[PDB]
């Protein structure tokens, strides 16, 4: 298939109260398709780092890979990790970019 | 090519808005969220993640996303039924909030 980039971002959480990422995921009768960055919030660690983008797929947190768990379980892990101190390592597939919110109609 | 295209005709007499948010890539435009009790919510067929291909006689496949959105707003503002043609996502998108 067409080449996709992956990046690993190490976040110093000392000066932040949040990653500042929303998470969206698709789950239906056909399976779970993984979890993605929905949007980013200025003021959080991920914005300050400046590499991750809406639409990127979150593959792994620290050494915990999500590709063989449910979206719900992946989110449980992310939840656990953000409530503990110290650096957070996020690895994303660069599936994102090019997204625009047009608002309500 | 599209898998599962549906035609959704909305009666816009009972409603003011479609009650959908739109996000575009580019790529094309997609349903971001659906607001309870709006035309689209009342209708029930369209789901978050579906791709919006056409409205009435205006096909978006040869149009920029910004132009598509402006066409759509113009049409919602004017009286008349609205026919949306969507390519289905399969549904099941979930918002998990913030971290
Ligand atoms: Cl990297």
Q: Which helix (H) or strand (E) holds A47?
A: helix A45-49
Q: Where are the beta strands (DSSP E) in A12-81?
A: 21-28, 31-40, 57-61, 64-65
Question: Which technique was the structure solved with, according to the deposited record?
Answer: X-ray
Contact yes or no for A50/A11 (Cβ under 8 A): no
Q: Give the tokens for residue A47.
A: 């914005």
Q: Check CB contact of A71 with chain B, cutoff 8 Å.
A: yes
Ligand 1 center–CA A92 separation, angstroms: 9
DSSP class of residue A2 equals: -
Instruction: Select the residue of A22, A35, A103 nearest B97 (Cβ to Cβ).
Output: A22
For every residue of A75-101, which 3-state class applies, written as one string? HHHHHHHHCCCCCEEEEEECCCCCEEE
The count of domains in chain A is 1
Find residues 25-64 of chain A whose CB sits inside 8 Å of chain B.
25-30, 35, 38, 41, 55
Task: Please tell me the distance from the alpha carbon of residue A40 to that of residue A51, in angstroms, as a whole number.
Answer: 11
Task: Please tell me the distance from the alpha carbon of residue B30 to that of residue B33, in angstroms, as a whole number.
Answer: 9
Range of the domain at B92: 1-99
Q: Where are the beta strands (DSSP E) in chain B?
A: 5-10, 20-25, 28-34, 51-55, 58-59, 82-87, 93-98
Q: Check CB contact of A99 with chain B, cutoff 8 Å.
A: yes
Please count the other Cβ atoms lying within 10 Å of the Cβ belonging to residue B20.
Answer: 24
- In 3D space, the residue among B57, B70, B75, B63 whose CA is nearest the CA of residue B22 turns out to be B70
């Amino acid at each position: 298939g067409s080449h996709m980039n992956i990046i690993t971002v190490t976040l110093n959480m000392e000066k932040y109260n949040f990653l500042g990422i929303s998470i969206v995921g698709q789950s239906n009768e056909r399976g779970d398709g993984g979890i993605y960055i929905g949007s980013i919030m200025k003021g959080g660690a991920v914005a300050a780092d400046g590499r991750i983008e809406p639409g990127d797929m979150l593959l792994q947190v620290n050494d915990m890979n999500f590709e063989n768990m449910s979206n719900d379980d992946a989110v449980r892990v992310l939840r656990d990790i953000v409530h503990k101190p110290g650096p957070i390592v996020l690895t994303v597939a660069k599936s994102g970019g090019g997204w625009k919110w047009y608002g309500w109609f």
